[PDB]
Amino acid sequence: NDFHRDTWAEVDLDAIYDNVENLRRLLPDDTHIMASVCGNAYGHGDVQVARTALEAGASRLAVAFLDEALALREKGIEAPILVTGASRPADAALAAQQRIALTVFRSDWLEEASALYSGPFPIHFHLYMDTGMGVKDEEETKRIVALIERHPHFVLEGLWTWFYQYTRFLHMLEWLPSRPPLVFCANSLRRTFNMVQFGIAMYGLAYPLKEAFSLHSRLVHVKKLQPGEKVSYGATYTAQTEEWIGTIPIGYKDGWLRRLQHFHVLVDGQKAPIVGRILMDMCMIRLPGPLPVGTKVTLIGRQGDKVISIDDVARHLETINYEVPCTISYRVPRIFFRHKRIMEVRNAIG
Amino acid sequence: NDFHRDTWAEVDLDAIYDNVENLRRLLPDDTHIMASVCGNAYGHGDVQVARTALEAGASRLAVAFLDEALALREKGIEAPILVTGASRPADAALAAQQRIALTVFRSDWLEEASALYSGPFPIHFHLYMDTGMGVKDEEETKRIVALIERHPHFVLEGLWTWFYQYTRFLHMLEWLPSRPPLVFCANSLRRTFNMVQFGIAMYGLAYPLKEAFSLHSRLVHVKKLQPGEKVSYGATYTAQTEEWIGTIPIGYKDGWLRRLQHFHVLVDGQKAPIVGRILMDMCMIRLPGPLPVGTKVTLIGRQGDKVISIDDVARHLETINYEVPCTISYRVPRIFFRHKRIMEVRNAIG
């Protein structure tokens, strides 16, 4: 709850709430919302985001692998959770005991699972259909359906796919004896389909969606450089004029990658360039003018008229926006805001 | 201690041990070895590496900010620890209570610290000297020395710098009434100087030094593609011939960045290219031929005659080797090997 370096992320849970609420309003009353919270909720904080999305109308959670579902259960989350990635047949008992749903991709994964597991908890499976470009034919599907019907503790909960592929999907749906409780697709189509995946869009990333993630630091040293003065930590920055250099305590170990050398952060309402090499723990910006140590630096977020968004950082790095909050390391504290006030602080490094 | 996805890192503590032992032999008996363990020991594991480096001859630890020193103390580490980065004057009482040494860069940081702290623990300070390109003149140094002598609980433990700069340093050393218990420089010069910084070289990264970090996965789906068959998850991979595609459960959320698309991993003793876009949680490789699911994929490490090193990954990414193990996310379990056998497993996600 306390932290001891002037570098932190802010997570606006009101933003999460609002994004989910707008969708919960728009969709029909009988279609479920699934909240994607893999990768520690894309660097925002798994349990804080899950709790908020659930309060706001989400009724189910999606994670990428079993450990992520286990961590949510451990932190007291009770809503249904789907593992959308690969899992070991041997971990079936664990998932069932923890009331975690598993995705199956291959009939012989299920053959192994069936041989290895006898009870006492039911396991819920979702079938991932290969819709074009997972399970791919009628024979494989029928096999799967037989395994589920023949095993006393197996249950076919859902069918899904990732997007002609649609008409393929319609066909594959007909291969089943009956329609499963839940049918949806993963990417977001945000038809029927009685569940939708609010993936990255819950975080404000691509009506109108609110962005949820800010990253900040403070100047920790300020220095006037004379024309010709050098700073060398690896590379060598040579001052062309009289200018001011500030240091901030964030580096590539924090996920503030060497490749953001150049990028323009916000100090005192002005864009300022990250200058010289990004080092493991500190980096230098050329300041808009002289400034006192302790001045806030905004790496992502709003300062005055200006705003830097995740999209901006993604462009400089040449990646998609997803990767940016995900790369911000666990050693960066997150301050969670809810109801315009401060709800909690997670410093993963006690 | 258990983990539930087939993706893991291996950390060879024998490598750490050996690297430190070779240095402990080479250096004079009165010069200390300082072990750099910031950034969770560069992604290898803070407490496991500290413990090993200490067992092997290191007598002091270096971290980048206070929270890192606090986490080490909390996990039972008792050796002296220096914070080499910036700290808040107000946290002085906390560092003193926890017997953590602090680096000072500016005399008015110390003026604040002195005003705010009265006791009961002594605080050890190290002065970082600006040696050319921190504290910069005689007047500032004398001020600092006066503050330390006048305060009952302040102690000047060390002097250091990062590298004519040398002769500057010799001069600055003479500004002090006496020589501090410890004098060293940070970068590695690996003269006197009674302490050296075994930074990145402890990890086998640049006589002969052993590399300590491996990263591995397993194939989780295998698929034969016919000439012209496509896979689309974002980008579109179009098979030019008949070929085999394997999926592994690692993605950019694991620190396996989109930019490693192309890079060549090891499967079945062969180099194989990472193909199509790197997605959040999975990625595809074109296989040397048909292979059963469960086949080990080595992202960094040795398989048969072949070896992929951290340096190789750094080159493909266009960064320094430091950044690579540091970027591998906390959600990747680390398996620690000591005495050729398995010492423990850290799955940060219980």
XYZ file of C-alpha atoms in Angstrom:
700
model
C 0.000 0.000 0.000
C 3.002 2.318 0.485
C 5.632 2.749 -2.232
C 9.025 4.403 -2.198
C 9.940 5.599 -5.694
C 8.261 8.519 -7.484
C 6.993 6.424 -10.395
C 3.497 5.001 -10.487
C 0.610 3.953 -12.675
C -2.977 5.145 -12.212
C -5.947 2.949 -13.008
C -9.371 4.551 -13.296
C -11.940 1.905 -12.321
C -14.714 4.455 -13.058
C -13.562 4.214 -16.671
C -13.867 0.417 -16.588
C -17.291 0.729 -14.928
C -18.553 3.252 -17.464
C -17.295 1.305 -20.502
C -19.031 -1.873 -19.292
C -22.213 -0.014 -18.286
C -22.635 1.554 -21.719
C -22.344 -1.904 -23.311
C -24.648 -3.507 -20.695
C -27.260 -0.915 -21.714
C -26.802 -1.354 -25.483
C -27.005 -5.195 -25.600
C -30.266 -7.250 -25.297
C -31.178 -8.425 -21.769
C -30.492 -12.107 -22.537
C -26.972 -11.774 -23.980
C -24.135 -12.125 -21.433
C -21.049 -9.892 -21.216
C -17.701 -11.671 -20.837
C -14.862 -9.561 -19.337
C -11.371 -10.318 -20.613
C -8.909 -10.076 -17.710
C -5.862 -12.069 -18.885
C -2.369 -10.718 -18.290
C -3.279 -9.196 -14.952
C -6.131 -7.428 -16.760
C -3.688 -6.117 -19.371
C -1.456 -4.604 -16.710
C -4.337 -2.808 -14.956
C -4.852 -5.304 -12.097
C -6.769 -8.588 -12.357
C -8.989 -8.564 -9.272
C -9.671 -4.806 -9.213
C -10.853 -4.859 -12.840
C -12.828 -8.144 -12.538
C -14.690 -6.849 -9.462
C -15.510 -3.586 -11.252
C -16.574 -5.209 -14.534
C -18.825 -7.626 -12.607
C -20.404 -4.780 -10.547
C -21.116 -3.043 -13.853
C -22.901 -5.887 -15.662
C -20.281 -8.457 -16.758
C -21.306 -11.940 -15.656
C -18.270 -14.024 -16.679
C -14.488 -13.681 -16.880
C -11.939 -14.798 -19.463
C -8.268 -15.556 -18.753
C -5.542 -17.052 -20.922
C -4.275 -19.921 -18.774
C -5.176 -21.843 -15.611
C -2.826 -20.033 -13.179
C -4.651 -16.781 -14.011
C -8.031 -18.345 -13.097
C -6.504 -19.816 -9.903
C -5.150 -16.423 -8.864
C -8.581 -14.819 -9.314
C -10.301 -17.549 -7.228
C -7.574 -17.113 -4.571
C -8.246 -13.356 -4.389
C -11.920 -14.120 -3.749
C -13.519 -13.840 -7.195
C -16.635 -16.031 -7.466
C -17.957 -15.323 -10.966
C -17.557 -17.991 -13.669
C -14.134 -18.019 -15.366
C -13.200 -19.440 -18.790
C -9.632 -20.440 -19.637
C -9.370 -19.528 -23.330
C -5.851 -20.903 -23.866
C -4.214 -24.333 -23.640
C -4.364 -26.503 -20.530
C -3.028 -29.878 -19.349
C -5.565 -32.797 -19.294
C -4.098 -33.760 -15.889
C -5.187 -30.335 -14.433
C -8.827 -31.114 -15.146
C -9.507 -32.066 -11.466
C -7.987 -28.782 -10.318
C -10.098 -26.684 -12.724
C -13.285 -28.598 -11.761
C -12.630 -28.263 -8.036
C -12.097 -24.522 -8.581
C -15.186 -24.175 -10.851
C -13.105 -22.986 -13.769
C -14.228 -23.667 -17.304
C -11.750 -25.055 -19.860
C -11.542 -24.612 -23.633
C -10.935 -27.738 -25.703
C -9.278 -27.646 -29.120
C -8.756 -31.324 -29.960
C -10.746 -34.490 -29.344
C -7.744 -36.448 -28.052
C -7.070 -33.791 -25.399
C -10.573 -34.761 -24.215
C -9.780 -38.479 -24.550
C -6.817 -37.983 -22.196
C -8.907 -35.835 -19.859
C -11.651 -38.462 -19.722
C -9.206 -41.310 -18.975
C -7.433 -39.322 -16.212
C -10.468 -37.851 -14.397
C -13.313 -39.667 -12.587
C -14.690 -37.126 -10.046
C -16.173 -35.678 -7.880
C -16.640 -32.206 -9.405
C -18.251 -31.571 -12.815
C -16.015 -29.877 -15.407
C -17.421 -27.358 -17.850
C -15.930 -27.338 -21.354
C -16.180 -24.859 -24.193
C -15.400 -26.045 -27.695
C -13.233 -23.792 -29.811
C -14.254 -24.303 -33.450
C -11.804 -23.825 -36.303
C -13.893 -21.606 -38.485
C -11.488 -21.113 -41.364
C -7.993 -19.708 -41.008
C -9.173 -25.790 -33.092
C -11.735 -28.547 -33.895
C -12.210 -28.798 -37.634
C -14.669 -31.509 -38.823
C -17.925 -33.305 -38.009
C -16.263 -36.578 -37.000
C -14.068 -34.865 -34.406
C -17.044 -32.873 -33.040
C -19.250 -36.006 -32.700
C -16.425 -37.773 -30.881
C -16.184 -34.848 -28.454
C -19.970 -34.863 -27.922
C -19.863 -38.600 -27.267
C -17.044 -38.214 -24.698
C -18.961 -35.517 -22.876
C -22.235 -37.463 -22.842
C -20.535 -40.743 -21.760
C -18.590 -39.124 -18.844
C -20.781 -38.502 -15.708
C -18.858 -35.333 -14.700
C -18.252 -33.744 -18.145
C -20.482 -30.852 -19.332
C -20.530 -29.016 -22.679
C -21.036 -25.395 -21.551
C -20.039 -23.319 -24.559
C -19.054 -23.111 -28.182
C -16.904 -20.330 -29.585
C -14.587 -19.200 -32.363
C -12.416 -16.321 -33.628
C -13.404 -14.607 -36.869
C -18.075 -17.349 -44.856
C -16.293 -18.201 -41.581
C -19.678 -17.259 -40.115
C -21.588 -19.669 -42.326
C -18.954 -22.316 -41.478
C -19.737 -21.583 -37.829
C -23.481 -21.939 -38.396
C -22.819 -25.351 -39.937
C -20.575 -26.488 -37.069
C -23.242 -25.423 -34.569
C -25.621 -27.827 -36.328
C -23.236 -30.769 -35.756
C -24.233 -30.724 -32.074
C -27.260 -32.682 -30.741
C -28.385 -29.468 -29.016
C -27.278 -25.858 -28.623
C -24.876 -25.359 -25.650
C -25.850 -22.951 -22.845
C -23.359 -20.388 -24.277
C -22.357 -19.488 -27.835
C -20.036 -16.555 -28.616
C -17.053 -15.345 -30.606
C -13.755 -14.084 -29.201
C -12.585 -11.148 -31.270
C -14.152 -7.685 -30.748
C -17.615 -8.768 -33.314
C -19.003 -6.306 -30.779
C -26.530 -11.439 -34.062
C -26.920 -14.399 -31.740
C -24.725 -15.589 -30.007
C -25.778 -15.114 -26.437
C -22.475 -13.794 -25.000
C -20.009 -11.158 -26.215
C -16.346 -10.674 -25.515
C -15.573 -7.204 -24.173
C -11.849 -7.626 -24.688
C -9.514 -4.685 -25.065
C -12.381 -2.236 -25.544
C -13.299 -2.420 -21.824
C -10.006 -0.640 -21.266
C -10.735 2.121 -23.680
C -8.596 0.786 -26.398
C -9.444 0.030 -29.958
C -19.176 5.084 -28.006
C -17.168 6.955 -26.713
C -14.827 4.659 -24.711
C -12.883 5.986 -21.703
C -9.175 5.136 -21.368
C -8.248 3.660 -17.956
C -4.459 3.642 -17.635
C -2.024 6.454 -16.781
C 1.703 6.334 -16.063
C 3.635 9.045 -14.177
C 6.952 10.005 -12.683
C 8.708 12.965 -11.001
C 11.905 14.826 -11.823
C 14.573 13.693 -9.440
C 17.549 15.761 -10.639
C 17.729 18.847 -12.873
C 20.882 20.109 -14.654
C 21.746 23.033 -16.965
C 24.002 21.973 -19.846
C 26.258 24.460 -21.644
C 26.763 24.288 -25.414
C 29.099 21.345 -26.030
C 28.552 19.620 -22.630
C 28.172 15.834 -22.856
C 26.240 13.222 -20.917
C 27.469 9.655 -21.397
C 25.777 6.579 -20.012
C 26.438 4.180 -22.885
C 25.735 6.414 -25.922
C 26.707 10.136 -25.525
C 24.315 13.069 -25.731
C 26.044 16.266 -26.875
C 24.259 19.524 -26.017
C 24.012 21.771 -29.086
C 22.876 24.802 -26.975
C 22.295 25.869 -23.390
C 19.475 23.619 -22.109
C 17.995 21.845 -19.115
C 18.141 18.093 -18.459
C 15.875 16.323 -15.926
C 16.237 12.734 -14.698
C 13.231 10.537 -13.850
C 13.336 7.215 -11.933
C 11.910 4.956 -14.644
C 13.838 2.682 -16.958
C 13.651 -0.295 -19.225
C 13.379 -2.649 -16.275
C 10.010 -0.965 -15.590
C 8.894 -1.816 -19.121
C 9.821 1.663 -20.220
C 11.757 0.209 -23.127
C 15.002 1.507 -24.709
C 12.996 1.992 -27.906
C 11.026 4.875 -26.314
C 14.245 6.884 -26.481
C 13.081 9.965 -28.445
C 9.389 9.730 -27.530
C 7.842 12.898 -26.090
C 6.539 12.932 -22.504
C 4.609 15.697 -20.675
C 6.304 17.983 -18.118
C 4.735 21.279 -17.044
C 2.099 21.013 -19.803
C 4.773 20.733 -22.522
C 6.015 17.913 -24.725
C 9.663 17.107 -23.930
C 11.868 14.529 -25.592
C 13.368 11.480 -23.897
C 16.989 12.058 -24.687
C 20.063 9.794 -24.710
C 19.851 6.033 -24.051
C 17.106 4.601 -21.850
C 18.970 2.984 -18.929
C 17.740 0.182 -16.619
C 16.380 2.456 -13.910
C 16.602 6.144 -14.928
C 16.151 8.283 -18.082
C 16.730 11.869 -19.122
C 14.429 14.385 -20.720
C 15.301 17.729 -22.221
C 13.141 20.133 -20.300
C 11.022 22.985 -21.701
C 13.051 25.241 -19.361
C 14.382 25.236 -15.756
C 12.152 23.199 -13.403
C 12.315 22.184 -9.714
C 12.879 18.554 -8.803
C 9.537 16.977 -7.869
C 7.792 18.252 -11.009
C 5.383 15.642 -12.322
C 6.190 13.899 -15.593
C 3.325 12.180 -17.399
C 4.376 9.320 -19.663
C 0.778 8.390 -20.539
C -2.197 10.573 -19.537
C -3.261 14.216 -19.481
C -1.406 17.366 -18.479
C -3.186 20.678 -19.207
C -4.388 20.825 -22.795
C -2.103 17.963 -23.874
C -2.729 14.219 -23.707
C -0.501 11.215 -24.477
C -2.495 8.014 -25.072
C -1.560 4.296 -25.181
C -1.982 4.554 -28.959
C 0.769 7.200 -29.117
C 3.226 4.952 -27.231
C 2.265 1.984 -29.477
C 3.012 4.022 -32.606
C 6.465 5.143 -31.421
C 7.219 1.513 -30.524
C 5.581 0.101 -33.714
C 3.267 -2.320 -31.902
C -0.360 -2.601 -31.083
C -1.820 -0.757 -28.122
C -2.427 -4.035 -26.210
C 1.305 -4.568 -25.627
C 1.930 -1.218 -23.898
C 0.092 -1.533 -20.524
C 1.000 -5.236 -20.504
C 4.711 -4.405 -20.625
C 4.655 -2.026 -17.687
C 6.281 -4.110 -15.025
C 4.832 -5.446 -11.784
C 7.344 -3.288 -9.895
C 5.389 -0.164 -10.911
C 2.732 0.531 -8.227
C -0.841 0.948 -9.453
C -3.116 3.496 -7.767
C -6.750 2.556 -8.241
C -9.390 5.264 -8.397
C -13.077 4.473 -7.852
C -15.896 7.014 -7.380
C -13.475 9.846 -8.250
C -11.513 9.005 -5.086
C -8.605 6.651 -4.263
C -9.668 3.072 -3.619
C -6.318 1.335 -3.107
C -2.654 1.033 -3.947
C -1.080 -2.229 -5.175
C 2.728 -2.269 -4.794
C 3.511 -5.840 -5.859
C 6.857 -5.421 -4.107
C 5.449 -4.836 -0.628
C 5.616 -24.069 -6.528
C 3.238 -25.691 -9.046
C 2.469 -24.044 -12.390
C -0.126 -24.806 -15.022
C 1.081 -23.633 -18.437
C 3.913 -25.266 -20.403
C 6.094 -22.150 -20.468
C 8.846 -21.558 -17.950
C 12.210 -19.977 -17.318
C 15.213 -21.823 -15.874
C 17.742 -20.119 -13.644
C 21.058 -21.842 -13.003
C 22.273 -20.708 -9.570
C 25.431 -22.827 -10.086
C 26.248 -20.389 -12.884
C 25.803 -17.428 -10.526
C 27.908 -19.214 -7.888
C 30.697 -20.032 -10.326
C 30.836 -16.525 -11.838
C 31.136 -14.950 -8.372
C 33.637 -17.570 -7.158
C 36.005 -16.964 -10.064
C 35.966 -13.226 -9.290
C 36.307 -13.815 -5.514
C 39.479 -15.781 -6.321
C 40.925 -13.215 -8.755
C 40.489 -10.088 -6.555
C 42.732 -9.170 -3.543
C 41.511 -10.378 -0.121
C 40.681 -6.856 1.116
C 38.497 -5.696 -1.795
C 34.750 -6.362 -1.378
C 32.423 -7.749 -4.064
C 29.094 -5.947 -4.508
C 26.303 -8.003 -6.164
C 23.870 -6.065 -8.335
C 20.362 -7.475 -7.831
C 18.039 -4.674 -9.011
C 15.023 -5.493 -11.159
C 14.364 -8.767 -9.388
C 17.996 -9.664 -10.119
C 17.484 -8.818 -13.797
C 14.513 -11.156 -14.054
C 16.369 -14.097 -12.470
C 14.921 -13.792 -8.936
C 16.101 -11.331 -6.276
C 16.417 -13.482 -3.158
C 17.616 -16.663 -4.900
C 20.443 -14.774 -6.630
C 21.387 -12.640 -3.574
C 21.626 -15.747 -1.363
C 23.792 -17.507 -3.958
C 26.072 -14.526 -4.635
C 26.576 -14.060 -0.874
C 27.360 -17.793 -0.344
C 29.938 -17.447 -3.117
C 31.868 -14.441 -1.779
C 29.765 -11.294 -2.365
C 29.466 -9.289 0.842
C 27.059 -6.503 -0.182
C 24.027 -6.008 -2.424
C 22.989 -3.204 -4.763
C 19.398 -2.356 -5.733
C 17.935 0.550 -7.679
C 15.278 1.867 -5.299
C 14.102 1.470 -1.698
C 11.200 -0.957 -2.333
C 13.728 -3.424 -3.788
C 15.847 -3.268 -0.596
C 12.683 -3.624 1.540
C 11.603 -6.712 -0.391
C 15.007 -8.346 0.147
C 14.928 -7.625 3.920
C 11.355 -9.006 4.020
C 12.483 -12.254 2.353
C 15.128 -12.639 5.064
C 18.273 -11.192 3.475
C 20.661 -9.814 6.117
C 23.674 -8.634 4.109
C 24.242 -4.885 3.659
C 22.207 -3.307 0.836
C 22.906 -0.062 -1.060
C 20.149 1.843 -2.853
C 21.957 3.243 -5.905
C 19.019 5.266 -7.258
C 16.926 8.187 -5.999
C 15.099 8.151 -2.672
C 12.787 10.435 -0.672
C 14.394 12.315 2.302
C 11.263 11.420 4.317
C 12.039 7.646 3.878
C 15.339 8.045 5.700
C 13.883 6.611 8.977
C 12.588 3.579 7.095
C 15.955 2.883 5.413
C 17.825 3.328 8.736
C 15.443 1.063 10.638
C 15.919 -1.552 7.897
C 19.738 -1.083 7.789
C 19.665 -0.029 4.164
C 22.288 2.325 2.819
C 21.248 5.321 0.686
C 23.062 7.135 -2.124
C 23.055 10.932 -2.009
C 23.404 13.079 -5.123
C 22.749 16.609 -3.852
C 23.567 18.467 -0.651
C 20.038 19.835 -0.225
C 18.586 16.309 -0.344
C 20.775 15.813 2.750
C 19.629 19.137 4.234
C 16.021 17.920 3.983
C 16.975 14.503 5.346
C 18.766 16.066 8.312
C 15.827 18.364 9.171
C 13.276 15.506 8.944
C 15.174 12.766 10.831
C 16.344 12.711 14.477
C 16.661 8.987 15.390
C 17.068 6.336 16.731
C 18.838 4.319 14.011
C 22.036 5.457 12.250
C 21.756 5.947 8.472
C 24.619 5.055 6.171
C 25.139 7.280 3.124
C 27.218 6.846 0.003
C 28.129 9.918 -2.000
C 27.763 9.677 -5.749
C 30.381 11.970 -7.310
C 29.840 13.625 -10.677
C 33.095 12.708 -12.293
C 32.609 14.358 -15.663
C 29.721 13.632 -17.998
C 25.649 13.849 -8.810
C 27.741 16.080 -6.474
C 29.993 18.316 -8.523
C 32.201 20.746 -6.516
C 34.226 21.168 -3.321
C 31.742 23.523 -1.654
C 28.873 21.057 -2.049
C 31.039 18.161 -0.780
C 32.185 20.110 2.332
C 28.571 20.996 3.084
C 27.647 17.306 2.885
C 30.571 16.361 5.158
C 29.500 19.020 7.644
C 25.884 17.745 7.669
C 27.048 14.207 8.299
C 29.458 15.187 11.081
C 26.904 17.514 12.779
C 24.065 14.897 12.774
C 24.434 12.241 15.572
C 22.851 9.450 13.460
C 24.360 10.225 10.013
C 27.348 8.177 8.735
C 29.403 8.584 5.544
C 29.887 4.939 4.485
C 30.930 5.141 0.848
C 31.971 7.194 -2.126
C 31.350 6.120 -5.701
C 30.997 7.184 -9.321
C 30.305 5.956 -12.873
C 33.079 6.238 -15.450
C 40.595 12.155 -16.726
C 37.282 11.299 -15.017
C 39.561 9.122 -12.882
C 41.876 11.983 -11.988
C 38.763 14.095 -11.274
C 37.702 11.303 -8.918
C 41.089 11.260 -7.188
C 40.717 14.997 -6.595
C 37.172 14.681 -5.224
C 38.342 11.944 -2.849
C 40.824 14.464 -1.427
C 38.010 16.926 -0.599
C 36.994 14.633 2.276
C 38.534 14.930 5.785
C 39.169 11.169 5.658
C 38.662 8.229 3.310
C 35.214 6.562 3.744
C 35.033 2.865 4.699
C 34.100 2.042 1.055
C 35.214 3.505 -2.276
C 34.159 1.985 -5.619
C 32.859 2.655 -9.110
C 29.581 1.416 -10.580
C 30.151 0.424 -14.181
C 31.812 -2.935 -15.007
C 35.848 -1.212 -14.309
C 36.163 -4.872 -13.349
C 43.291 -0.184 -8.766
C 41.930 0.819 -5.383
C 38.991 1.179 -4.695
C 38.154 -1.406 -2.108
C 34.866 -2.710 -3.594
C 33.857 -3.719 -7.126
C 30.494 -3.868 -8.800
C 29.764 -7.290 -10.283
C 26.807 -6.011 -12.266
C 25.537 -7.763 -15.358
C 28.626 -9.964 -15.603
C 27.484 -12.080 -12.615
C 24.731 -13.258 -14.928
C 27.049 -14.245 -17.690
C 26.388 -11.259 -19.787
C 28.776 -8.782 -21.244
C 36.883 -15.651 -17.903
C 34.858 -17.542 -19.139
C 31.467 -16.417 -17.724
C 28.532 -18.851 -17.503
C 25.084 -17.712 -18.683
C 22.316 -18.292 -16.098
C 18.951 -17.800 -17.799
C 16.950 -20.127 -20.069
C 13.418 -19.789 -21.423
C 11.302 -22.705 -22.709
C 7.911 -23.748 -23.962
C 6.090 -26.781 -25.432
C 4.131 -27.260 -28.640
C 0.473 -27.232 -27.801
C -1.073 -27.704 -31.259
C 0.443 -28.895 -34.550
C -1.098 -28.356 -38.020
C -0.149 -29.256 -41.615
C -0.777 -26.379 -44.032
C -1.340 -26.974 -47.752
C 0.115 -24.615 -50.363
C -2.057 -21.488 -50.282
C -3.618 -22.117 -46.817
C -3.840 -19.003 -44.629
C -3.645 -18.331 -40.911
C -5.060 -14.971 -39.828
C -4.867 -13.569 -36.329
C -4.386 -9.896 -37.175
C -1.865 -10.100 -40.058
C -2.241 -13.155 -42.398
C 0.393 -15.818 -42.981
C 0.068 -17.447 -46.409
C 1.707 -20.869 -46.790
C 3.861 -20.986 -49.933
C 4.277 -24.821 -49.699
C 3.137 -27.811 -47.677
C 4.477 -27.212 -44.142
C 3.903 -27.733 -40.441
C 2.794 -25.055 -37.965
C 3.116 -25.456 -34.168
C 1.565 -23.195 -31.521
C 3.292 -22.426 -28.204
C 1.655 -20.815 -25.130
C 3.841 -17.708 -24.892
C 2.990 -14.231 -26.087
C 3.780 -10.581 -25.783
C 2.106 -10.401 -22.394
C 4.896 -12.730 -21.195
C 7.479 -10.241 -22.443
C 7.858 -12.262 -25.597
C 7.444 -9.109 -27.647
C 5.730 -8.695 -31.054
C 9.129 -7.626 -32.391
C 10.486 -11.193 -31.988
C 8.203 -12.159 -34.866
C 10.715 -13.732 -37.297
C 13.328 -14.703 -34.697
C 14.455 -18.339 -34.770
C 13.745 -20.622 -31.796
C 14.928 -24.221 -31.193
C 12.598 -27.216 -31.683
C 13.951 -30.753 -32.054
C 17.529 -29.435 -32.362
C 16.601 -27.206 -35.328
C 16.178 -23.471 -35.794
C 12.555 -22.637 -36.669
C 11.087 -19.237 -37.408
C 8.432 -17.477 -35.341
C 5.875 -16.867 -38.016
C 2.898 -14.495 -38.308
C 2.088 -11.874 -35.644
C 3.043 -12.442 -32.011
C -0.292 -12.468 -30.141
C -0.911 -11.730 -26.429
C -0.741 -15.332 -25.265
C 0.228 -17.690 -28.127
C 2.580 -17.708 -31.160
C 3.241 -19.909 -34.159
C 6.430 -21.432 -35.456
C 7.035 -23.127 -38.767
C 8.304 -26.526 -37.783
C 11.298 -28.401 -39.234
C 8.791 -31.190 -40.017
C 5.840 -32.995 -38.344
C 6.177 -33.073 -34.531
C 3.994 -34.313 -31.640
C 2.425 -31.805 -29.279
C 4.500 -31.643 -26.086
C 7.786 -31.197 -27.965
C 10.032 -28.769 -26.122
C 10.706 -25.373 -27.671
C 13.742 -23.463 -26.422
C 13.504 -19.694 -26.808
C 16.824 -19.074 -25.029
C 19.208 -21.917 -24.104
C 20.711 -25.071 -25.591
C 19.184 -27.854 -27.661
C 21.631 -30.420 -29.107
C 24.491 -28.718 -30.915
C 22.610 -25.403 -31.155
C 22.404 -22.589 -28.610
C 20.391 -19.345 -28.541
C 21.820 -16.775 -26.106
C 20.440 -13.554 -24.546
C 22.755 -11.698 -26.936
C 20.972 -13.263 -29.930
C 17.551 -12.091 -28.676
C 18.985 -8.595 -27.970
C 20.294 -8.337 -31.537
C 16.972 -9.312 -33.151
C 15.250 -6.763 -30.895
C 18.005 -4.104 -31.341
C 18.620 -3.580 -27.620
C 21.219 -4.447 -25.091
C 21.272 -7.862 -23.468
C 20.246 -6.408 -20.062
C 16.706 -5.660 -21.273
C 15.885 -9.229 -22.360
C 15.672 -11.204 -19.056
C 14.252 -8.073 -17.408
C 11.324 -8.030 -19.837
C 10.296 -11.620 -19.244
C 7.212 -11.163 -17.157
C 6.561 -12.173 -13.560
C 3.858 -14.544 -14.825
C 6.566 -16.827 -16.262
C 7.570 -19.367 -13.564
C 11.281 -19.630 -12.787
C 12.790 -23.034 -11.979
C 15.936 -22.639 -9.915
C 18.715 -25.192 -10.211
C 21.414 -25.504 -7.540
C 23.997 -28.308 -7.242
C 22.886 -29.678 -10.637
C 19.480 -30.450 -9.098
C 16.198 -28.512 -8.704
C 16.147 -26.178 -5.722
C 12.757 -24.485 -6.103
C 10.036 -23.130 -8.335
C 8.763 -19.532 -8.085
C 5.348 -19.054 -9.744
C 4.606 -15.437 -8.814
C 0.965 -16.185 -9.607
C 0.493 -18.869 -6.961
